[PDB]
Design a protein around this ligand. Sequence first.
Ligand SMILES: Nc1nc2c(ncn2[C@@H]2O[C@H](COP(=O)(O)OP(=O)(O)O)[C@@H](O)[C@H]2O)c(=O)[nH]1
Ligand SMILES: [Mg+2]
Length: 288
Amino acid sequence: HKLLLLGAGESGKSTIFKQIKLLFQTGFDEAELRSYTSVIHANVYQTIKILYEGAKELSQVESDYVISPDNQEIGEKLSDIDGRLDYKELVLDVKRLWQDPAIQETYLRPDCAQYFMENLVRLAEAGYVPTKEDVLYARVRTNGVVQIQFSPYRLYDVVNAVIFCAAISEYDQMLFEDETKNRMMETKELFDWVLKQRCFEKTSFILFLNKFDICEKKIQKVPLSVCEWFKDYQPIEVEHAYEFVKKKFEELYFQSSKPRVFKIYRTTALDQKLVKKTFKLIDESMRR
Ligand SMILES: Nc1nc2c(ncn2[C@@H]2O[C@H](COP(=O)(O)OP(=O)(O)O)[C@@H](O)[C@H]2O)c(=O)[nH]1
Ligand SMILES: [Mg+2]
């Protein structure tokens, strides 16, 4: 019955966790969405907060990002909020907070947050219930362990099965935390390190290759050979490049060869019913 979620950075494991929550019951789902609006509101408020803080700092350190002077008085009420406690007047402020191009070139430097910036007025009014997409895009800092038991059987996010989330699209990107390191390389480092440890030998392994939609969008412009792991790559399309990444993920797994159980899944975490399928396939596969 046991499943554990392991990933690196923005692997999407919490998103998998979230939409398994919307998909399965976990009957209430009350107002689950309704309890989650406070969260959603929060990211709206600290997103334009970090956006505002950026523009001024970069303006001080770089020869100009200049804000509109009349905005500062409504602009720093933002800093006056501080999220003291779970927080249409604010949407009129925030839209009228945004208009300077400065803070969007600081933006054009969290991809989910821009969505929220496209849906304020729907969130504004009292008759608001978040869509399923609002829940998925909502960012909740994961504190501790989260247990969910449900039957179509507990899922953990921070054991009979380890779901490893590898965001194949991250091959372009360096680490957000470390500009030197590459996230695909850190995924390989993490994946290898998890495979080597003696505490998950008994555990069955399921691998998710996430953010595939970004992969099909991005592959046609940036070569996959940028990655040192994928430097071997030379095209003839999308399916082959994806299966190429599989090869690497395969051969990497099998080199940890001691004289059991392995599965790989093509996943998009931000859409659901692609994902329902994935769970259907592994829960029927989890025989014995
Ligand atoms: N395009 C796309 N983005 C995703 C998907 N899953 C997650 N994300 C992005 O990843 C971020 C959140 O990842 P998260 O679940 O927190 O990864 P975690 O920190 O390892 O749990 C969000 O900004 C999403 O936009 C996906 O299937 N497709
Ligand atoms: Mg997470």
